[PDB]
Amino acid sequence: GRLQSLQTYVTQQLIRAAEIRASANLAATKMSECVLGQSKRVDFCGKGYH
Amino acid sequence: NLLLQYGSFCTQLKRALTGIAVEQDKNTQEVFAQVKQIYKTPPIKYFGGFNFSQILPDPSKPSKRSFIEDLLFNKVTLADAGFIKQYGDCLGDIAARDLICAQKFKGLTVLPPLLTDEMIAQYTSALLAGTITSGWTFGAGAALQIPFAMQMAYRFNGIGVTQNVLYENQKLIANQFNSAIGKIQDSLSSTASALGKLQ
Amino acid sequence: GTNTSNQVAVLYQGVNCTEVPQLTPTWRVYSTGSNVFQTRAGCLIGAEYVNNSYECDIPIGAGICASYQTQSQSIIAYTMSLGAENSVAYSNNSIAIPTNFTISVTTEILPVSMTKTSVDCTMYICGDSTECSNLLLQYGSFCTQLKRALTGIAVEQDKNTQEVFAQVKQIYKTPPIKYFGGFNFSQILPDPSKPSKRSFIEDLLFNKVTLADLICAQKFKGLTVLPPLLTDEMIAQYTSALLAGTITSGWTFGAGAALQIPFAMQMAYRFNGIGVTQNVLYENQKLIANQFNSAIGKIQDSLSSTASALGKLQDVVNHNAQALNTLVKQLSSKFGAISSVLNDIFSRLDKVEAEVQIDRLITGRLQSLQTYVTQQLIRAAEIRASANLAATKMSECVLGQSKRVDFCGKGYHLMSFPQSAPHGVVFLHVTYVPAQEKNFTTAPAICHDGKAHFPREGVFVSNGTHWFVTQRNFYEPQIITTDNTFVSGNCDVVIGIVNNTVYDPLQPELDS
Amino acid sequence: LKSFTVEKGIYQTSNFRVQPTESIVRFPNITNLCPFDEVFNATRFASVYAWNRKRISNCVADYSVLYNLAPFFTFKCYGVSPTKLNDLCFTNVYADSFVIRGDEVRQIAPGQTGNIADYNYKLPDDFTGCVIAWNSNKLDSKVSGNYNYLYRLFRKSNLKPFERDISTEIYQYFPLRSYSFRPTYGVGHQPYRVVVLSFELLHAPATVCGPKKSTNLVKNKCVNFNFNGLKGTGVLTESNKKFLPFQQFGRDIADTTDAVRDPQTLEILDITPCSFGGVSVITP
Ligand SMILES: *[C@@H]1O[C@H](CO)[C@@H](O[C@@H]2O[C@H](CO)[C@@H](O[C@@H]3O[C@H](CO[C@H]4O[C@H](CO)[C@@H](O)[C@H](O)[C@@H]4O)[C@@H](O)[C@H](O[C@H]4O[C@H](CO)[C@@H](O)[C@H](O)[C@@H]4O)[C@@H]3O)[C@H](O)[C@H]2NC(C)=O)[C@H](O)[C@H]1NC(C)=O
Ligand SMILES: *[C@@H]1O[C@H](CO)[C@@H](O[C@@H]2O[C@H](CO)[C@@H](O[C@@H]3O[C@H](CO[C@H]4O[C@H](CO)[C@@H](O)[C@H](O)[C@@H]4O)[C@@H](O)[C@H](O[C@H]4O[C@H](CO)[C@@H](O)[C@H](O)[C@@H]4O)[C@@H]3O)[C@H](O)[C@H]2NC(C)=O)[C@H](O)[C@H]1NC(C)=O
Ligand SMILES: *[C@@H]1O[C@H](CO)[C@@H](O[C@@H]2O[C@H](CO)[C@@H](O[C@@H]3O[C@H](CO[C@H]4O[C@H](CO)[C@@H](O)[C@H](O)[C@@H]4O)[C@@H](O)[C@H](O[C@H]4O[C@H](CO)[C@@H](O)[C@H](O)[C@@H]4O)[C@@H]3O)[C@H](O)[C@H]2NC(C)=O)[C@H](O)[C@H]1NC(C)=O
Ligand SMILES: *[C@@H]1O[C@H](CO)[C@@H](O[C@@H]2O[C@H](CO)[C@@H](O[C@@H]3O[C@H](CO[C@H]4O[C@H](CO)[C@@H](O)[C@H](O)[C@@H]4O)[C@@H](O)[C@H](O[C@H]4O[C@H](CO)[C@@H](O)[C@H](O)[C@@H]4O)[C@@H]3O)[C@H](O)[C@H]2NC(C)=O)[C@H](O)[C@H]1NC(C)=O
Ligand SMILES: *[C@@H]1O[C@H](CO)[C@@H](O[C@@H]2O[C@H](CO)[C@@H](O[C@@H]3O[C@H](CO)[C@@H](O)[C@H](O)[C@@H]3O)[C@H](O)[C@H]2NC(C)=O)[C@H](O)[C@H]1NC(C)=O
Ligand SMILES: *[C@@H]1O[C@H](CO)[C@@H](O[C@@H]2O[C@H](CO)[C@@H](O[C@@H]3O[C@H](CO)[C@@H](O)[C@H](O)[C@@H]3O)[C@H](O)[C@H]2NC(C)=O)[C@H](O)[C@H]1NC(C)=O
Ligand SMILES: *[C@@H]1O[C@H](CO)[C@@H](O[C@@H]2O[C@H](CO)[C@@H](O[C@@H]3O[C@H](CO)[C@@H](O)[C@H](O)[C@@H]3O)[C@H](O)[C@H]2NC(C)=O)[C@H](O)[C@H]1NC(C)=O
Ligand SMILES: *[C@@H]1O[C@H](CO)[C@@H](O[C@@H]2O[C@H](CO)[C@@H](O)[C@H](O)[C@H]2NC(C)=O)[C@H](O)[C@H]1NC(C)=O
Ligand SMILES: *[C@@H]1O[C@H](CO)[C@@H](O[C@@H]2O[C@H](CO)[C@@H](O)[C@H](O)[C@H]2NC(C)=O)[C@H](O)[C@H]1NC(C)=O
Ligand SMILES: *[C@@H]1O[C@H](CO)[C@@H](O[C@@H]2O[C@H](CO)[C@@H](O)[C@H](O)[C@H]2NC(C)=O)[C@H](O)[C@H]1NC(C)=O
Ligand SMILES: *[C@@H]1O[C@H](CO)[C@@H](O)[C@H](O)[C@H]1NC(C)=O
Ligand SMILES: *[C@@H]1O[C@H](CO)[C@@H](O)[C@H](O)[C@H]1NC(C)=O
Numbered sequence A: 001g002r003l004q005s006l007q008t009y010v011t012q013q014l015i016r017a018a019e020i021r022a023s024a025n026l027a028a029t030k031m032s033e034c035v036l037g038q039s040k041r042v043d044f045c046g047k048g049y050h
Numbered sequence B: 001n002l003l004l005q006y007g008s009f010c011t012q013l014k015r016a017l018t019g020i021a022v023e024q025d026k027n028t029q030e031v032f033a034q035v036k037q038i039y040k041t042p043p044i045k046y047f048g049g050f051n052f053s054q055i056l057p058d059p060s061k062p063s064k065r066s067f068i069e070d071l072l073f074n075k076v077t078l079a080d081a082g083f084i085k086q087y088g089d090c091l092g093d094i095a096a097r098d099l100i101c102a103q104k105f106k107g108l109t110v111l112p113p114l115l116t117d118e119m120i121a122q123y124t125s126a127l128l129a130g131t132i133t134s135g136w137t138f139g140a141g142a143a144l145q146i147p148f149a150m151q152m153a154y155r156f157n158g159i160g161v162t163q164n165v166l167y168e169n170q171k172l173i174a175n176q177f178n179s180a181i182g183k184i185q186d187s188l189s190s191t192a193s194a195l196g197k198l199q
Numbered sequence C: 001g002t003n004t005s006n007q008v009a010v011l012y013q014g015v016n017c018t019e020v021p022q023l024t025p026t027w028r029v030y031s032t033g034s035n036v037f038q039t040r041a042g043c044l045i046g047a048e049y050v051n052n053s054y055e056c057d058i059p060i061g062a063g064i065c066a067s068y069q070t071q072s073q074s075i076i077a078y079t080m081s082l083g084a085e086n087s088v089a090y091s092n093n094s095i096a097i098p099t100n101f102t103i104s105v106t107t108e109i110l111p112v113s114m115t116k117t118s119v120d121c122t123m124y125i126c127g128d129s130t131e132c133s134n135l136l137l138q139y140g141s142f143c144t145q146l147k148r149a150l151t152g153i154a155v156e157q158d159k160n161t162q163e164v165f166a167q168v169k170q171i172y173k174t175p176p177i178k179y180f181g182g183f184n185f186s187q188i189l190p191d192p193s194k195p196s197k198r199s200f201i202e203d204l205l206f207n208k209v210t211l212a213d214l215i216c217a218q219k220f221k222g223l224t225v226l227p228p229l230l231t232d233e234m235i236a237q238y239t240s241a242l243l244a245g246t247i248t249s250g251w252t253f254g255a256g257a258a259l260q261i262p263f264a265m266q267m268a269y270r271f272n273g274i275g276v277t278q279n280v281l282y283e284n285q286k287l288i289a290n291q292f293n294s295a296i297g298k299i300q301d302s303l304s305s306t307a308s309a310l311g312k313l314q315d316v317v318n319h320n321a322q323a324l325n326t327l328v329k330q331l332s333s334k335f336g337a338i339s340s341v342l343n344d345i346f347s348r349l350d351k352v353e354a355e356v357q358i359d360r361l362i363t364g365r366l367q368s369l370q371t372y373v374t375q376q377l378i379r380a381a382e383i384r385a386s387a388n389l390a391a392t393k394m395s396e397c398v399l400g401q402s403k404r405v406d407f408c409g410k411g412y413h414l415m416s417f418p419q420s421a422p423h424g425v426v427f428l429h430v431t432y433v434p435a436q437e438k439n440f441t442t443a444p445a446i447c448h449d450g451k452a453h454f455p456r457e458g459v460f461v462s463n464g465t466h467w468f469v470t471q472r473n474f475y476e477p478q479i480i481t482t483d484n485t486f487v488s489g490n491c492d493v494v495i496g497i498v499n500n501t502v503y504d505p506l507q508p509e510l511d512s
Numbered sequence D: 001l002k003s004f005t006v007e008k009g010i011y012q013t014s015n016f017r018v019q020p021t022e023s024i025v026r027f028p029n030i031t032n033l034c035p036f037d038e039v040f041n042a043t044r045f046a047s048v049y050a051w052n053r054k055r056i057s058n059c060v061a062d063y064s065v066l067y068n069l070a071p072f073f074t075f076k077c078y079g080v081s082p083t084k085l086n087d088l089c090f091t092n093v094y095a096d097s098f099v100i101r102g103d104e105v106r107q108i109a110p111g112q113t114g115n116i117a118d119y120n121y122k123l124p125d126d127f128t129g130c131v132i133a134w135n136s137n138k139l140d141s142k143v144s145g146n147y148n149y150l151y152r153l154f155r156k157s158n159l160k161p162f163e164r165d166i167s168t169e170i171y172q173y174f175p176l177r178s179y180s181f182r183p184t185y186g187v188g189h190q191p192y193r194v195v196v197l198s199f200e201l202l203h204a205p206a207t208v209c210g211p212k213k214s215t216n217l218v219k220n221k222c223v224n225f226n227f228n229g230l231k232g233t234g235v236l237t238e239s240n241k242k243f244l245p246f247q248q249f250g251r252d253i254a255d256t257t258d259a260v261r262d263p264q265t266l267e268i269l270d271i272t273p274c275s276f277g278g279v280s281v282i283t284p
């Protein structure tokens, strides 16, 4: 029972880690394309002309 | 002795948690460590009328964070998580019952991050200084210095507005930017529920 | 590494240094040492803390790293260094313009697909046993959904490879004359000498991955590896078609039919796409070709020397084997039964009480198989998320020219070339980097006759006496005339305006 | 698919395995019989001190002779079910034959505490073996008590299991007592002949096998095999593995026997499981 209880926590941590990694990749892309240069993608960095 | 017969479950759970713990530091290094050199602003803080005193670092603070970064750190009630609480009076019965001491007794610990906040603040300071004093030139090669009004006129020229508009309305543009920065400061000070995505 | 030395530091995590020194570990020499140091992570014993700035070698935590240095070789601990300190010389009327450039070809490695596996439930769980196979029917339909999940992953891997590589409709090929404007492409074009028509760099990338007796041992356990749908020759043909289309037609083979164009004119239009005028290439074509050939040779030397850059693919080889070797090694576990061999339980116990022992083994092996399937599903999701990015980079950088900052190499993007690799793709990104800076005095506009003159494109600069207008990304001074400037308003509004004479080209034509 | 209509595609349906043809029984060819008749039919049993530790090896053990005897009280076995004892083979079988009053027969067990159970000899917790009892009032019980047998009542230290520590000194009262076996006593005060059989299930070349008959050897074919109780199905080929002379079995990564030594000839056989795989149906 306790081993199953630990495995469920490890699996949920893996899923949340994948979601956090997707958000971190998006944050890295937003830092590269908007802080380090001007962006022409519509509504990628703020509403309006960036 | 009975758990030794169940096999290699503990090794693969420790391997998965070690992979997650390495991946978090890789995420932080991927996001913030994009600059090569730690740029710093010149001691004179005139940038064509634009006011960056609320996002540039404050030397009076011991953590060397800006005003808006101080508000962002105050709005999130981050737990100590036990890497701060390494003291041995967690073992002794003091104060009240604590969840961190209980889960430390249960075998569930929390490792500290590799990059402290005093280094993340230095990365954001370097990125702000490079963006202010060089524009987009520090992303490709060396940091080419440029006046900030000419940089902002080139930012207008990038979006299909001719650059005479800025040189005729620079004072109004700077006042609108300062008013918007003050509005962000008031919005972050008044409302504490804006950072729920981190919470 | 044990290849280098045998000295060891010990980090006691979350322990104050006045409380660490009975003990469960038998060894105690690294608990009462003379190099006790206190960090936020714990107590570090065995490494001397030196207060110098170095980059992180072995990460400890809280800004503290460790390394092995001749401080006489010993393990040292330090605070990690963020980078070199710089200060941009900002001023009200000072600009820095590059007078020279360089062409840099970098390497980006992306995983695309992983190993497709199939698991037989009955041979893995029971193994040549009849009564266990009869007892396994009471557990429902777990084997069907495990097989369905593995079949979905196996289809998804071929979908990933088809999505990444098969973005071209016709297999293009280069003409036998190989003069592409002075650029040397012999190290990425296919070689007919090899039986599998791959390039030099593709052969080096295939040799630098140790892609796989272990396979015969895990074959007997019901664990098989399915072959991929597209062989490596077909992937090499796709990369050859993409390379030939990009070389002989530019971006025009992505929007429709391929339109031929000389490589010098195409690469001049690549310069024109990033804000540099096309006469720069037509004046420095020999230098640009020499720099491109030198960068290709540097990539060849780097790939022949060091193989540690391909680890993003090597983990795809590793995690698909280390997860299998665990699954075999969990057949030795007893899970509270009397033996890990079912035939001994059958031949030593009667049917009343043997099934109680066999049920624990069945439940443990079923739990292990479900754990393997769950980790395979998570890893397949990660591999698909990488393959979508690889397909996007192939569509937007090989088949075009991207304006996104740092998407395809550091610098202003010019070209990209795809290469196959074991379970992945390798992009050679050809980018433009400004090289030789120079200081100049600038101004926003110029008063000619009481009216402001703004440049159309370029920067007003001064060399001390005269005023010129240049490009932003390359130093090319020119006489400020009415052709390259436009008039807007008077001189009383612009802050920082200066006085200079704006030339009129029409006036010498009236003097004829 | 649980459907009456199959669409176009390739579907994985089942798995094929090569079924075995012949069944092979293989055993060593010893013909000697056990000294069991020298144990249960002993004219006078020993006490707990002499303990009658008897080694049994190189025998063809027939436990059904104990099944053909009606006078048996208990046949209680740990690790191995008693009905399958003819289908196994054992390395060395140790018999302990003794006489104890019926109240303390239940005391002698692994993990059970008592006077005789602790002060004379324990049974270890990993005891794979059997205990057999019989109420023998005809020979052990004598008129006006049987004072030959002598047993402990007090001992300073709990003994390690299977020990022969014998001491007759007066402890800190004489700690030895004669039970005075009489035929007119109650059921709990009757003598019992108890024989404990302990077998070692090891990887050593075993000698005490069952009454099974060995068959011929079939090589390079999918056959069912039985090597000294080790049952399986596979192909037995000639192996070039250099077995050391003390070694008998060879094992894989997953603790499965993949190389065996024959108990009649001294050759080494490599066991490979029969050919198998999946079956896919390609249909429109
Ligand atoms: C760019 O923007 C910044 C920020 O707006 C301008 O800098 C000045 O910033 C301060 C606040 O940071 C403005 O307010 C003044 O604060 C003084 C200091 O007290 C505060 O700060 C300390 C920490 O330094 C806190 O601990 C403390 O609790 C306070 O929060 C006050 O003494 C001032 O009061 C004076 O003015 C008010 C005006 O109503 C009078 O009523 C008072 O009697 C008193 O005379 C004041 O509140 C300050 O206004 C900002 N300066 C200016 C000129 O606006 C930069 O100037 C700006 N730069 C540019 C180029 O635009
Ligand atoms: C495009 O839109 C903008 C608004 O975003 C117009 O700009 C001006 O905007 C401000 C509001 O932000 C208007 O009023 C301001 O009032 C402040 C207080 O002044 C009082 O007294 C004056 C004189 O009696 C009154 O007119 C005023 O209503 C107040 O009662 C002043 O401090 C303001 O000055 C600020 O703006 C000017 C630019 O206008 C800057 O140069 C200054 O540095 C300072 O930041 C201002 O007076 C104001 O009415 C708006 N301007 C006009 C002309 O109406 C733009 O004008 C508008 N553009 C066009 C083409 O419509
Ligand atoms: C912008 O930046 C680029 C590089 O980033 C510069 O290109 C280099 O320019 C220098 C100077 O003009 C070149 O150096 C000289 O090369 C001569 C021959 O060049 C050929 O051979 C080299 C290999 O040696 C090839 O790589 C090259 O492509 C040519 O085919 C040599 O004869 C020179 O030697 C002389 O100087 C040395 C000291 O340096 C003495 O020891 C010798 O005795 C001799 O007197 C010299 O080495 C260099 O080759 C160029 N590189 C490339 C790749 O072409 C641009 O000049 C620069 N532009 C501006 C405007 O600054
Ligand atoms: C780039 O070029 C521009 C224009 O060429 C320079 O800007 C100014 O240019 C004017 C002349 O071109 C300089 O001269 C001054 O003109 C002022 C404006 O004249 C009006 O007002 C007078 C009455 O004062 C009327 O008679 C006339 O018709 C106009 O309506 C005058 O006010 C100045 O008078 C000076 O002398 C009197 C005494 O007679 C003093 O009392 C005054 O205080 C003043 O000193 C003068 O004639 C003017 O100097 C220029 N401006 C500046 C700031 O220098 C730019 O200067 C030039 N750029 C650079 C970098 O030099
Ligand atoms: C473009 O011009 C700027 C402005 O001068 C240059 O920045 C600064 O250049 C000086 C000259 O060597 C650097 O040295 C410093 O000199 C001062 C005054 O002599 C001295 O007090 C200092 O101790 C130091 O030695 C200085 O580091 C440099 N940067 C700053 C922030 O001041 C710049 O180098 C020029 N760029 C090119 C490409 O010429
Ligand atoms: C484009 O680059 C390739 C290599 O990256 C050039 O191929 C090389 O050409 C040289 C001379 O034509 C060949 O000759 C010699 O080989 C010996 C070894 O056999 C070596 O020691 C010499 O230094 C010399 O390189 C060389 O074998 C050949 N290399 C390969 C791999 O084929 C090619 O010439 C370049 N194209 C142009 C147009 O410059
Ligand atoms: C101790 O002595 C007794 C008495 O002799 C043994 O019991 C007898 O053992 C034989 C085995 O040789 C049993 O088998 C056969 O039974 C059939 C049918 O009864 C008979 O026709 C055969 O001639 C043969 O006797 C026999 O059933 C069994 N019991 C009796 C009452 O004769 C015993 O095996 C000896 N050993 C031990 C360890 O107890
Ligand atoms: C963890 O270790 C530190 C360092 O030895 C302890 O800090 C000392 O605490 C004592 C009593 O609290 C003070 O008298 C010393 O001056 C402290 N030293 C320093 C350098 O600050 C700390 O108390 C330890 N933690 C616990 C729970 O005992
Ligand atoms: C350990 O690192 C060395 C390089 O530092 C590797 O190469 C050896 O280098 C030594 C030093 O000259 C030579 O004497 C040897 O002949 C080299 N080869 C070998 C096989 O030792 C070495 O391969 C590395 N070893 C491991 C196990 O990684
Ligand atoms: C009975 O077993 C013995 C040995 O346990 C056999 O005797 C010899 O066994 C060795 C073992 O490799 C063989 O090489 C010899 O050829 C055997 N000798 C003879 C004369 O065959 C003996 O053969 C076995 N008897 C039966 C009937 O199986
Ligand atoms: C010009 O530069 C000086 C010093 O760098 C600064 O104090 C001033 O604010 C700047 N702007 C103007 C308009 O003088
Ligand atoms: C750095 O370390 C040396 C020796 O460990 C010491 O003498 C010196 O005071 C230290 N300096 C600082 C700033 O900590």
Ligand SMILES: *[C@@H]1O[C@H](CO)[C@@H](O)[C@H](O)[C@H]1NC(C)=O
Residues within 6 Å of the ligand: C463, C464, C465, C466
């Ligand atoms: C500036 O350039 C002009 C035109 O090339 C030249 O005549 C003048 O001498 C230059 N001035 C300096 C200080 O180099």
Ligand SMILES: *[C@@H]1O[C@H](CO)[C@@H](O)[C@H](O)[C@H]1NC(C)=O
Residues within 6 Å of the ligand: D157, D165
């Ligand atoms: C056996 O062990 C006991 C205690 O473990 C010890 O006192 C005794 O001397 C040993 N030897 C004999 C012969 O009993």
